[PDB]
Design a binder for this molecule. Structure first.
Ligand code: NI
Ligand code: NI
Lengths: 211, 210
């Protein structure tokens, strides 16, 4: 149904819709390229691109037994991931979009509900970046971080619990020690600390307190 | 081990007699010496429930009486009612009083049925410790989290809405009140995680905090 592609050109939406049903009829390298381009420019699409990406990947595998789209999508994703520090320096918004996109691809591009190990290190590297002092000092980055933890924290922890323990240690540190967090940042961090402590869920009383 | 090292030699003897033979002592006096000393000694304020329980049971068995229990709880009430003036007089005496009340709650049971008469005295003390001005005092925060580690799960079952309200104050003090010390902030975060984990300390949190 809803692939959340409202932010694109009418013409580009037409291309994406065509890719969905008949990937053999489109240039899948180009399709991957327009998807990753827009994922950096639109908050909603950065958080929802996985829906259309999974559907094209499945369609291509069923049609031609091919993974041209996936390979091109993940190559481009790796290119953007590698340039994440310069992207963060250029634009906090493009950087938080990139993180949401990588994490959304992790969640949707599955073999069963087996995630792709190739995405584990990209996801963790981004979350660890967000958990540094000089990122927690930015409320936009904290919002991004906790969105990913709500979305895929439980799955990620399974993929590597020690990394998750180390990540949450940074979160306690930032929460405990670092003075220059906004009220909204401090609140987001406390909620996610309670969220993991409760087994990646929101108790009724915490729901009422925060929301 | 009844943790009575802080008493005089003569009072230690009275207490050891009372445990074995409550019928041969002035039980009103025994309760009096116990509450007096619970305000004065940290270790005794946290452990007096042990000896209190034992005398209560010794007396119920020996004479079917509750002179000790009634006199102990009467005196506890008198101290509880005087809590504001006690806190203003001595922060140390006040946290000893909180430890003592919560220790009596934990030990003076029927089944493991706590006494409802102790529920509001316990909660009132914890709510006082959770106020902005008390959170600003590291000694009061240490007292608060000790009680919550000891009897929080038990208390919550008595009245969950009060526990929910108490933890709302803890989040508030955590989030908003600037004048907490690094130790106070550490203790509060641990108790928040502790309750959220079902009154349990995760392995990773054990390592982080202890
Ligand atoms: Ni799975
Ligand atoms: Ni019980």
């Amino acid at each position: 149904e809803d692939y959340k592609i409202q932010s694109f050109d009418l013409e580009t939406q037409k291309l994406l819709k065509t890719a969905l049903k008949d990937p053999g009829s489109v240039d899948l390298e180009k399709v991957s390229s327009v998807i990753v381009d827009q994922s950096l420019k639109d908050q909603v699409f950065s958080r929802e691109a996985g829906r259309i990406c999974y559907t094209i990947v499945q369609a291509e595998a069923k049609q031609t037994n091919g993974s041209v789209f996936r390979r091109n999508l993940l190559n481009r994703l790796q290119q953007e991931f590698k340039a994440r520090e310069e992207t963060r320096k250029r634009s906090t918004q493009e950087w938080v979009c990139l993180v949401s996109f990588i994490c959304n691809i992790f969640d949707y591009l599955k073999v069963n509900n087996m995630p792709m190990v190739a995405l584990v290190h990209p996801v963790y590297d981004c979350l660890f970046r967000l958990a540094q002092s000089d990122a927690l000092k930015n409320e936009e980055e904290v919002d991004c971080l906790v969105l990913q933890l709500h979305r895929i924290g439980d799955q990620l922890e399974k993929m590597n619990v020690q990394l998750m323990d180390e990540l949450f240690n940074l979160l306690r540190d930032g929460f405990l020690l670092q003075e220059d967090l906004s009220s909204m940042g401090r609140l987001l961090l406390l909620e996610i600390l309670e969220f993991r402590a409760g087994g990646w869920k929101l108790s009724d009383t915490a729901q009422k307190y925060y929301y």
